Subunit: 31 residues, 5 copies
Amino acid sequence: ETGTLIVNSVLLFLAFVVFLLVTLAILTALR
Amino acid sequence: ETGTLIVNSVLLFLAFVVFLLVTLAILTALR
Amino acid sequence: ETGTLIVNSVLLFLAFVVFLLVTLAILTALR
Amino acid sequence: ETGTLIVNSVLLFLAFVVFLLVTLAILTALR
Amino acid sequence: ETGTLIVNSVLLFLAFVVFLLVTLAILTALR
């Protein structure tokens, strides 16, 4: 009906932050 | 009534990203 | 009124996944 | 109107779990 | 219509906590 439905979906984008964390962790561990 | 109810449930899938983080961490620590 | 109210609460369970991450991290660090 | 509005706010408390993770990580790294 | 719509957006701020975790992790790893 409105963006109110997409608002929750937008939050779902937080899943990217997780890979960001591993990005730094792997940047030092490599293997 | 509508998917609006499942939308929140979908976000719950974010729980998988957590194991993904430990996956990389354990891939270097093993033990 | 309906489970729609509990749906958000259910997501709150995600707080457990956090301790799960530290569980593996501490399983290698111990101290 | 009702707690339904606070329910989402309650979930926001999950922000504490994040510091909990760093707490253990820093407990071994110190520096 | 009301803040009820912004409430979900506010939770989105949790994305900051993720960088906070890497902040401590990188504070010890540097590289």
